C-alpha cells in the first residue's frame, strides 16, 4: 500500500530496533520485502489479522494463538490438502519483537545486532545464511534504499 505500510510498521520496527540493536530500516526492509509492502496477509479463519508479517510458523514451543492455512498440492494426479499453522500476534509490535528476540538469542547473528548501518546488517545476515540466498544482501539493500527515500 502506497507508503501506508511504513505508517503501520515504522513505530514497532523502531522499538524493536532499539531493543535489539538491529538497524531500523533493515527490519522494515525485510518486512516490506517478505510481505510485498504488507500486501501478503495471513488471516485467521474469521478474516482477522494475524499481524504475522514474516509469516512465522507456529511450533510446539509457541504458546500463543494460531491460525491454520490450507493449500493444495496436485501430485501423482491426487489432490493433497496440506495445512500449516501460523503464529497469531497481538500486534505488529509483538510480531517484530518476536523476530528480533530470536536474532538476539543466537550468536550467528551477532554481526546484525551490532551493525552500524542497515546495509551492513543486510551483509551480516547474508553471511549467517539468512534466506539462503548468497546474493541476499543485494536484494535487501535495494529495498532499504527505497525505504530511506521515503522515511
Ligand atoms: Na531482543
Author numbering: 151 to 301
What text does the study give?
Members of GH family 73 (GH73) are β-N-acetylglucosaminidases that cleave the β-1,4 glycosidic linkage between the N-acetylglucosamine (GlcNAc) and N-acetylmuramic acid (MurNAc) residues of bacterial cell wall peptidoglycan (PG). In some instances, GH73 enzymes are associated with bacterial pathogenicity, for example, LytB being critical for pneumococcal nasal colonization and cell division, Auto for pathogenic listeriosis caused by Listeria monocytogenes, and FlgJ for biogenesis and function of the flagellum, which is a major virulence factor of motile pathogenic bacteria. The domain was found to adopt a lysozyme-like fold common to other GH73 enzymes, which consists of an α-helical subdomain packed against a β-lobe that forms an extended β-hairpin motif. The α-helical domain and β-hairpin of StFlgJGH(151–316) together form a groove-shaped active site, with the α-helical subdomain containing an α-central helix that houses a conserved glutamate general acid/base (E184), and the β-hairpin, in turn, containing a second glutamate residue (E223) previously determined to be required for GH activity.
Next, we determined the crystal structure of the truncated GH domain (StFlgJGH(151–301)) to 2.2 Å resolution to study the active site of StFlgJ in the absence of the C-terminal α-helix. The asymmetric unit contained three copies of the truncated domain. Though the C-terminal α-helix no longer occupied the active site, the catalytic β-hairpin of each domain was found to partly occlude the active site of neighbouring domains in the crystal structure. While this crystal packing did not provide an unobstructed active site, it did impart significant structural order to the β-hairpin. The β-hairpin was found to be located further from the helical domain of the enzyme than any previously reported structure of a GH73 enzyme, including Auto and SpFlgJ. A superposition of StFlgJ with the structures of other GH73 enzymes reveals substantial differences in the position of the β-hairpin harboring the putative catalytic E223 residue. Removing the C-terminal α-helix, however, allowed us to determine a 2.1 Å crystal structure of the domain in which the extended β-hairpin, known to accommodate a second putative catalytic carboxyl group, was well ordered and revealed that the active site of StFlgJ seems capable of opening widely, possibly aiding in substrate capture and turnover. Contrary to our hypothesis, the assays revealed that the StFlgJ GH domain is fully active both with and without the C-terminal α-helix, indicating that the helix does not auto-inhibit StFlgJ GH activity and is likely not functionally equivalent to the N-terminal auto-inhibitory helix of Auto.
